[PDB]
Amino acid sequence: HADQDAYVADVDGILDVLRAQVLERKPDDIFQFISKSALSLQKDRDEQKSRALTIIVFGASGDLAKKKTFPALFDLYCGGLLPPEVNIIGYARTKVDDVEKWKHETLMKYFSNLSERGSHAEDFLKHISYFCGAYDSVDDFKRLDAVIREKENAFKGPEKGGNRLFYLALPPSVFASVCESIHKGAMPQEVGGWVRVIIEKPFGRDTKSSAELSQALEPFFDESQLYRIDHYLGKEMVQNIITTRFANRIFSAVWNASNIACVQITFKETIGTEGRGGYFDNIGIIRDVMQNHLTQILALLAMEKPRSLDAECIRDEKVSVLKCIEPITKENCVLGQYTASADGSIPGYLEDVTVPEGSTCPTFAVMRLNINNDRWAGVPFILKAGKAVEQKYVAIRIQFRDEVHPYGEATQRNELVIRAQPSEAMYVKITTKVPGLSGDLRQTHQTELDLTYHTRLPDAYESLINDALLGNSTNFVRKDELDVAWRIFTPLLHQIDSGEIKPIPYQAGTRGPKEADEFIANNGFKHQK
Amino acid sequence: HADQDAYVADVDGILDVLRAQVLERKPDDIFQFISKSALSLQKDRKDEQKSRALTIIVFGASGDLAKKKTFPALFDLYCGGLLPPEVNIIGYARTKVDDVEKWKHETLMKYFSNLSERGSHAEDFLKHISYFCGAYDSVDDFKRLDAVIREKENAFKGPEKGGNRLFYLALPPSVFASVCESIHKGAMPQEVGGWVRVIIEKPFGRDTKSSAELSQALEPFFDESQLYRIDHYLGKEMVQNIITTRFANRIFSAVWNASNIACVQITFKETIGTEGRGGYFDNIGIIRDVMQNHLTQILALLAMEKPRSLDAECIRDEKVSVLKCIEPITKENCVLGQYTASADGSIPGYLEDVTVPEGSTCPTFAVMRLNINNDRWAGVPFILKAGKAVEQKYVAIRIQFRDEVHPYGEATQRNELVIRAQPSEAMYVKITTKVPGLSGDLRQTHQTELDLTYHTRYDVRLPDAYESLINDALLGNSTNFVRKDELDVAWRIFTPLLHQIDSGEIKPIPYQAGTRGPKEADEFIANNGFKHQ
Ligand SMILES: NC(=O)C1=CN([C@@H]2O[C@H](COP(=O)(O)OP(=O)(O)OC[C@H]3O[C@@H](n4cnc5c(N)ncnc54)[C@H](OP(=O)(O)O)[C@@H]3O)[C@@H](O)[C@H]2O)C=CC1
Ligand SMILES: NC(=O)C1=CN([C@@H]2O[C@H](COP(=O)(O)OP(=O)(O)OC[C@H]3O[C@@H](n4cnc5c(N)ncnc54)[C@H](OP(=O)(O)O)[C@@H]3O)[C@@H](O)[C@H]2O)C=CC1
């Protein structure tokens, strides 16, 4: 045969994936971990149809729309999470003389798993049309409204009107123009239907510019209609944070300063900005992922118990705890900027032709936040994010206060870890006895206890779009929430923009600046064993 | 000549194994069984106690406990490398034995386990065993025993002189005081060096007065660093599960109290009945048999305050302190049962035993509530349950945590912590977690069990509770042994109830063997803080 080279190739394929999984979890029980992971790798081997639904994607010619938004709508479609009569309209200034060719040669190529999904892509494209128009024309939005109304009137069922989800896959400088135009020309039919508007980051760049944008949108849409989306906040992580704590006496009781020594929230990527460091260059890693994404995780982790599990009680508590956070100081922040990797594989951040010469834009930051309330006073909250570092990894790590007595050096800090990348996991680390008579009471082991552990759908982005269709605003930042968050970070961001602290170089592929790990060790973190 | 002795040795070695296998596996064709085994056997093929001589003296060596449990446990420690290389084991009993080597190779070896693979080890082990036919109340015999022990102590290949002496009383308790007086008078360790430890078998009395009288009888001869009152059922693995999982860890240390725990149940369940020995059981009852001793020690370890160190006596100090916070159990806090024949007829009733007095009201089942009146536990019901001839074999601790009513409401329930010893070891929490992805909104949850145990690389076939206890005595660790003050406090918790029972004031409810027990018992548990899952 030549299939012998294919059987060997597959075998070596399963075994290398198993190798990487075992080497990540590092269980002492290698045999049973190998056993289950092979069994699991073989595994991988009417409320809402009641009304017409129209999705309008502004900026549909752009990078985000064709590479992420339309493919996510495709995945929701194939998962049967869109109603069967959904109509999707792309809206953009770009002339398109031939709409069917645009759908097939531009949009369809970025659809995922086109092999297995035979005939589903062409079915989905039937739900898509294109409107070439201006974002700031009231008349064009009246014309768009006539087109939407024709699609809503085709709905076969008895519910009148139609729901409209507007998706602003556009620079934020166009947001207020689009929302005014919708308000004046294309609100839902009076006979029935909601309007919801998905807004993309950046939501301003400091307290004053973000407040200006919110003030510009609020004449047109209220906080039950605006959905400020954070692509990275998956439903699974949020449920792990809320349910594992608040449904359980054991975890609820220790979620406080009497029991917790340190909290770290960490967002790491091996990729750099190598492609287009240029438009990262005026944002930097703090605005990019930490004032928005890591701070929402922080709010969900640190909030008081909400009055119910309803969306706005949860957002109420996110706002309440964020208000207890002192503005971060320049003394509590260490910045990095990555250079070329030791092996030359990854060029340095400045070696990008789209990055201005002499840029001091930070690609790495670690900072300490202080939450000054009864539950959290004195507990270090460390946020860390970095581009081009040693691994792809996103996790929460809670370190509990050590029980010095009576085990002494035979014990150490308990931990609770909630990981989103490279795979979902949630586990605790505690001291246990060692089985067998070889060990007296002082012979212990630091043991990991997995609540969940996945190998490396709908994804997080798709779950948020689905959340907006279902009217669930939990994972979206509210207007008041956003202002408080910007007030935590803006004094620091101003100090950085004045050069008061400056990034330390680090080679792509390392952990980052050595000073960042020194800062972490100085702010209450302790390494296991 | 060397090979002639080596050959006969090997032959006798195979023969001893075969005889043991036939005597134990009781085949009706002896000839066929010997042949199948013989061919199969062909196919089958610390520095501190290396330092001084060790002598283990087993009194009552002729008896049932000695041959069936104590010597085989000693064999298992020998194979696990847990006895010093030149250890000397002396069986001491009144029974005349005209042929000691026959006793060692036919009577003792019959009960050694896994002779298939350990037969040559069994022969090595028996070279360490001698037999002393003697009286327990003889000054002169104990002088003679001391001379035997000293001769072999004094030949020891090692740095320190003298020798450590471990005495095991595999005897009725009525003999303890006399044999202890004899040891103290004539067979204490040489003054030049060595400790003495004495393992005492149960029962330790049968109420406060009788138990105190026995302790008062023993204390002129051995202090509490010398007496080891053994409970065979309290294994090292459960005790470390109780102590380490809590006190080494912030997470469990912080919820181990009445602000967090709604109720605690400690349960000892057997499917077997009294198995034709109902007369022996009839004068003991289930409370004295397993509850005042075994379950109460588990309770003390679960409920105690943090010990000042992990030293054995610091732990025993805390066991004593928490037991002193418990009022004597009253009959309104107790439900008793006595088992009748199983519905299928496979288990005869307790009263159908011919050795059981007619009209006996002896309890074979009991559930009771104990209150620990202190800051950590005030208001927390502690339920002890023990039963013969019930629906399953099961020994566990179950801790129910106070429910988190808000915000999940009926989408959550009480967390639980379970520590299980039988029929297999386990330790886990039951908690409420999200249900994967999909429709599942925040309020869609399920209960899952989070294992709390360390999973080692190879399957650890760790020894039984009994052998770990003998090892602990050999190493000088009294943690799992009941101390004299602890014993008295425990009897005072239970004796007023045992008096009420012996006065007829509470009379067992019948229940068929194989059921859970009297239905009044499950009602009692439901009325005292437990909630079904
Ligand atoms: N993966 C991604 O692409 C990322 C997306 N984002 C955010 O998502 C949103 C869209 O991202 P992306 O597609 O990359 O952005 P683009 O800058 O590529 O804009 C998308 C579309 O918007 C129109 N557009 C661009 N500039 C203007 C302008 N001044 N006035 C009117 N229309 C304009 C263009 O379509 P036309 O000319 O046809 O009208 C363009 O094709 C932005 O808010 C962005 O900050 C942030 C992080 C990464
Ligand atoms: N598996 C078991 O058998 C269990 C027993 N125990 C306890 O262990 C101890 C011994 O158990 P077990 O072997 O069954 O008891 P036995 O009644 O069988 O006595 C053990 C030995 O002690 C001697 N003996 C018996 N009665 C007397 C007496 N009045 N005076 C002097 N010697 C006597 C006998 O040896 P000799 O005549 O040769 O001197 C006997 O063989 C007891 O305290 C028992 O309650 C606890 C756990 C389980």
Residue numbers in the entry:
A (entry chain A): 7 to 51, 65 to 475, 480 to 552
B (entry chain B): 7 to 51, 64 to 551
Structure paper excerpt:
Moreover, the LdG6PD wt structure, complexed with NADP(H), revealed a disulfide bond between C138 and C56; however, with minor conformational changes, an alternative disulfide bond between C138 and C61 or C56 and C97 is also possible. Therefore, we generated a second mutant by replacing C138 with a serine (LdG6PDC138S). In contrast, the LdG6PD wt and the LdG6PDC138S mutant, complexed with NADP(H), G6P, or both substrates, adopt C121 space group symmetry with one dimer in the AU (AB). Comparing the LdG6PDC138S structures to the wt structures revealed no major conformational changes (RMSD = 0.4 Å with 1056 residues). Accordingly, the mutation revealed no alternative disulfide bridge and the oligomerization profile did not significantly differ from the wt. Although the KM of G6P increased by about 20%, indicating a lower affinity, the activity Vmax increased to the same extent so that catalytic efficiency remained stable. For NADP+, catalytic efficiency slightly increased from 14.5 ± 1.6 µM−1 s−1 to 17.3 ± 0.8 µM−1 s−1 due to the increased Vmax but stable KM.
